[PDB]
Design a protein around this ligand. Structure first.
Ligand SMILES: CCCCC[C@H](CC(=O)NO)C(=O)N[C@H](C(=O)N1CCC[C@H]1CO)C(C)C
Ligand SMILES: CCCCC[C@H](CC(=O)NO)C(=O)N[C@H](C(=O)N1CCC[C@H]1CO)C(C)C
Ligand SMILES: NC(=O)CN(CC(=O)O)CC(=O)O
Ligand SMILES: NC(=O)CN(CC(=O)O)CC(=O)O
Ligand SMILES: [Zn+2]
Ligand SMILES: [Zn+2]
Lengths: 169, 169
């Protein structure tokens, strides 16, 4: 099923997600709904926090033909270099806005797979950017948090305006 | 200490490496010697089999400045995709030759780290190719084994001539 995606400045996006203790079929059902929601948006990644489920679960598919699904449960990352890359990021929870964000160029991801088994994976490029962006969501952080207060304020005001107009529909 | 690197068609390269039961002082010394040997060659990977030590130990460093050492003890891998990647592969035991070899582009690695602790790592790109190349060595397999019979024999003949001339130096 398609799930509702929370939008900035909804305070629920600031909730810190709780770790998953057992990866059962119920967790996999949520994962399937997250994937369906992500593919339909469309987006290349999605954190449970974004659909109002505060558990540390992330889904992703960096392919063009939407044929490479990846699951990260209880994800964490550690920079493997001090070098930083700049990427213009967008977010399904901050629809319509794209801004530059500087983040570690390479990181080591650690998480549980869709079966609950632990693994690690070195990430560079888009994968590195996405994993950091998704993990941030689980810690109640949004990419607009890295921007100047004036830019974030402009975005907030534009979105709050849109929300009021959408409410008048 | 820099160890000697065996070269095709030396029969000892066909030896199947035995598993490591404990990462003791001796094993720790070998790993250091292997890194020294690898960097001096220079190469981006090295299997114990290549320095005539038939234990399942692999070292790597895909960086350009010796800043990313990697250790794999008792490594094994499983393809995670059917998609094949073609890469121009070379080998310190088959110096001067680079031939295309098709291998799965994404694999899951299972091994023990430099401290003797088990871990599983998802690999793509160069890392995916190198781990398969290195594990093959531990099973007495060389990349030329994937080439046609005439191409492999041509390479063999070339090296035998070289070895012949080197001995007269
Ligand atoms: C930069 C990496 C961002 C991680 C994923 C986000 C989706 C998200 O909100 N995850 O929490 C995404 O797909 N964002 C899209 C996006 O910004 N993309 C998608 C591909 C490249 C990049 C271009 O800016 C937009 C169009 C919704
Ligand atoms: C492609 C992966 C190969 C695994 C590593 C080998 C070394 C080896 O013999 N390992 O067992 C290597 O460093 N090979 C080099 C090599 O083939 N390379 C190094 C970087 C890229 C690639 C192609 O040129 C050459 C130059 C000796
Ligand atoms: N073994 C894997 O597929 C690795 N991971 C995700 C990845 O592909 O990066 C686990 C998951 O998708 O459940
Ligand atoms: N977390 C890691 O460093 C993983 N591994 C190997 C790697 O770097 O891929 C351990 C080792 O190098 O002993
Ligand atoms: Zn987002
Ligand atoms: Zn080799």
């Amino acid at each position: 099923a398609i799930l509702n995606i929370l939008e900035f400045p909804d305070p629920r996006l600031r909730t810190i997600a709780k770790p998953v203790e057992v990866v059962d079929d119920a967790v996999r059902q949520l994962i399937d709904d997250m994937f369906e929601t992500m593919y339909e948006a469309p987006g290349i990644g999605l954190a449970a926090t974004q659909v109002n489920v505060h558990k540390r679960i992330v889904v992703m598919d960096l392919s063009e033909d939407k044929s490479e699904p990846r699951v990260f449960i209880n994800p964490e990352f550690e920079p493997l270099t001090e070098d930083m890359d700049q990427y213009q990021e967008g977010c399904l929870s901050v629809p319509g806005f794209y801004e530059n964000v500087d983040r570690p160029q390479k990181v080591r991801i650690k998480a549980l797979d869709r079966d609950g088994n632990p693994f690690e994976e070195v990430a560079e490029g888009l994968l590195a950017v996405c994993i950091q962006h998704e993990c941030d969501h689980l810690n109640g952080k949004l990419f607009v948090d890295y921007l100047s207060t004036l830019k974030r304020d402009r975005i907030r005001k534009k979105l709050e305006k849109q929300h009021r107009q959408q409410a008048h529909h």
